[PDB]
Design a protein around this ligand. Structure first.
Ligand SMILES: *Cc1cc2c(cc1C)nc1c(=O)[nH]c(=O)nc-1n2C[C@@H](O)[C@@H](O)[C@@H](O)COP(=O)(O)OP(=O)(O)OC[C@H]1O[C@@H](n2cnc3c(N)ncnc32)[C@H](O)[C@@H]1O
Ligand code: HEC
Ligand code: HEC
Lengths: 174, 401
């Protein structure tokens, strides 16, 4: 069976050498919580998380390969995607992030290698995160009940301007 | 250790094997022989032809991997003959290699279509290598008279990135609209069916007219319609069933085989492609040379940039560890070829492969891969274009580095 690095070689095509994607829209998957990785990857595989292609990709690997692979991605250092955020909005993002997301999205949603569990969002490519949210609000992706509430009702006390502000803030974190 | 590995060819495949080797253990001096300055991509050139991408965007230097510990000697290889492990190049240099990676690309075979020549290329262009060639075709589409008809002529059998002709027809059709729903793309093909056909047809229906025949693309099947052995600067092509198609811009895409140096060296077989061992890409003909993806026979791995990259890795790893250590291991290879049909409409085919059982035999892992479902929603088609670009930006960075 191939080494973790053999299997991870073949993903450099779409999200960077080591998982750090260059522009403009693929997600960087470099520092990734190995637990979150098999969940997502096996989710992609089952079809429950709507993909454009990762269900096709994922379906050819199996749990242990997702483990070898998450083992492989965990040791890399994530590199923030240098892109343009909104200054006027960078700020408001922070505030709203505390008040609604900070509960689970660890310190600006940064890749904290704080042993286990975290959802990387700082320095991730904005188009992706925009898509990410779309699959949520539209119910294409399973969404945890608290993750929802804060988003689904609460964030929207700000409306879409809210999400804009959040997208600008995660992008400032470079 | 202080080893010399010579890599002949420094395009996607060659470059990938070069850097990843140097990268894999920096004491090996890796010299990369390539006739030229710049690598013009071809995997997103049809967007230049469609008019959305400047030619500037697909040009790329060796400065990256060079300044990474690879000696980029710009020269064409001329001979290679093993035994006394030497490599000679059109100007007097012979480099000794402990192992060599030959990655030459496709030789296009003009002969096969009587009328076409190396010098016909400049007027009736196959932009199946890019650069200059892509510019010619773009000038011709900018120069066409509104009403002008463009024909595109796929070879058949094995060629490089199969959806290529049809994404070109989509990109061209995308542009032609600049000349009023008044123009036409005519594809005279050598095959009954083709890659991502139903998705291509659904796309075409949706965007450029297609069942409508008040439609901007026309697809004419094959072998009949295979544009054979005649075309002339009377601006006519003649298919194998003798019809004459007069068109203002014709793009003939000639049959292809392993690049010339693979033939001089002795690496090609009966088909004119090089037999490799599937685990390490070493040639089944001459030992110590590893040939990668285009010029090599890799079971269902389509001749693509992606496949080149993957194989490049299996090669890089295969030689470096085999080079100075012990028994390399098992690999997994992957491919996905992306096709953008209109700025908002994109499709893809993707696949995962594994050494099926034992020995030479690359077979796709069952139940995986596929191409954008025909019933794909708006978001998928819209997203895929962006993921196509992302794939480009990433793979040209993974590769030259
Ligand atoms: C042209 C085309 C191909 C496509 C494509 C669309 C078009 C119009 N679309 C693709 C896509 O969307 N996705 C892909 O994954 N690939 C696409 N491709 C395929 C194609 O571009 C790749 O297969 C190809 O570029 C990679 O193949 P390769 O690595 O085997 O070869 P190369 O052309 O990249 O470079 C080979 C290299 O060798 C040099 N050379 C030749 N002969 C010598 C000698 N004597 N010594 C030294 N150098 C030598 C040659 O000049 C070239 O640079
Ligand atoms: C391009 C053809 C891809 C290849 C090859 C691989 N991935 Fe991928 N990945 C790609 C895209 C476009 C996306 C977005 C999802 C979609 O299909 O719409 C992703 C995403 C991931 C993720 C999710 C990351 C996140 O932020 O949630 C993971 C876990 C991931 N990809 C892993 C992965 C691995 C391990 C691969 C190599 C075997 C791989 N991908 C290949 C595009 C492509
Ligand atoms: C705690 C529970 C929360 C809260 C309060 C929010 N999120 Fe986050 N989020 C959470 C989980 C467990 C997951 C994984 C998916 C699942 O529910 O099974 C996520 C994921 C995200 C993502 C996608 C990440 C990716 O795969 O790349 C995003 C973009 C995201 N969450 C954003 C986000 C924002 C903006 C929130 C505040 C309104 C928010 N989450 C709250 C768990 C939780």
């Amino acid at each position: 069976e191939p080494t973790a690095e053999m299997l991870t070689n073949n993903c450099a095509g779409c999200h960077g050498t080591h998982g750090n994607s260059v522009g403009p829209a693929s997600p960087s998957i470099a520092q990734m919580d190995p637990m979150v990785f098999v969940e997502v990857m096996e989710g992609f595989k089952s079809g429950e998380i709507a993909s454009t292609i990762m269900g096709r990709i994922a379906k050819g690997y199996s749990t242990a390969d997702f483990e070898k692979m998450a083992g492989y991605f965990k040791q890399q250092t994530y590199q923030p995607a240098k892109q343009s955020f909104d200054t006027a909005l960078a700020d408001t993002g922070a505030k709203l992030h505390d008040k609604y997301c900070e509960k689970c999205h660890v310190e600006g949603g940064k890749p904290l290698a704080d042993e286990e569990d975290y959802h990387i969002l700082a320095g991730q490519w904005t188009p992706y995160l925009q898509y990410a949210m779309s699959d949520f609000r539209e119910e294409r992706r399973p969404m945890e009940k608290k993750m929802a509430s804060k988003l689904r009702e609460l964030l929207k006390a700000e409306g879409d301007a809210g999400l804009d502000a959040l997208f600008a803030f995660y992008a400032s974190q470079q | 250790a202080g080893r010399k590995v010579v890599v002949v060819g420094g395009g996607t495949g060659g470059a990938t094997a070069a850097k990843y080797i140097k990268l894999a253990d920096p004491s090996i001096e890796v010299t990369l022989i390539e006739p030229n300055t710049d690598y013009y991509t071809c995997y997103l050139s049809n967007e230049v032809i469609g008019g959305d991408r400047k030619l500037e965007s697909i040009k790329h230097g060796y400065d990256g991997l060079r300044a990474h510990g690879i000696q980029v000697v710009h020269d064409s290889a001329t001979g290679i003959d093993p035994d006394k492990k030497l490599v000679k190049t059109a100007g007097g240099a012979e480099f000794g290699y402990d192992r060599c990676v030959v990655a030459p690309g496709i030789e296009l075979i003009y002969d096969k279509i009587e009328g076409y020549s190396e010098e016909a290329a400049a007027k009736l262009p196959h932009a199946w290598k890019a650069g200059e060639q892509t510019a010619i075709l773009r000038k011709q589409l900018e120069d066409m008279a509104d009403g002008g008809t463009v024909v595109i002529a796929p070879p058949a059998a094995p060629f490089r990135c199969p959806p290529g002709p049809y994404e070109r027809a989509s990109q061209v059709a995308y542009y032609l609209k600049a000349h009023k729903p008044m123009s036409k793309v005519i594809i005279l093909d050598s095959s009954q069916t083709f890659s991502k056909q139903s998705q291509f047809s659904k796309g075409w229906e949706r965007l450029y007219g297609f069942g409508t025949e008040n439609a901007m693309i026309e697809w004419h099947p094959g072998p009949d319609s295979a544009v054979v052995k005649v075309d002339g600067g009377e601006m006519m092509v003649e298919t194998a069933f003798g019809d004459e198609f007069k068109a203002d811009v014709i793009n003939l895409i000639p049959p292809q085989r392993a690049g010339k140096i693979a033939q001089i060296a002795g690496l090609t077989n009966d088909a004119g492609w090089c037999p490799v061992d599937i685990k390490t890409f070493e040639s089944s003909i001459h030992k110590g040379i590893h040939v990668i993806g285009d010029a090599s026979i890799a079971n269902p791995m389509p001749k693509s940039g992606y496949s080149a990259n993957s194989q490049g890795k299996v090669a890089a790893a295969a030689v470096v560890v085999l080079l100075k250590g012990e028994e390399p291991g098992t690999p997994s290879y992957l491919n996905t070829c992306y096709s953008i049909l209109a700025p908002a409409y994109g499709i893809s085919v993707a696949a995962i492969y594994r050494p099926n059982a034992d020995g030479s035999a690359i077979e796709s892992v069952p139940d995986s891969g596929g191409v954008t479902p025909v019933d794909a929603p708006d978001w998928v088609l819209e997203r895929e274009v962006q993921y196509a670009y992302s794939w480009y930006n990433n793979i040209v960075h993974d590769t030259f580095g």
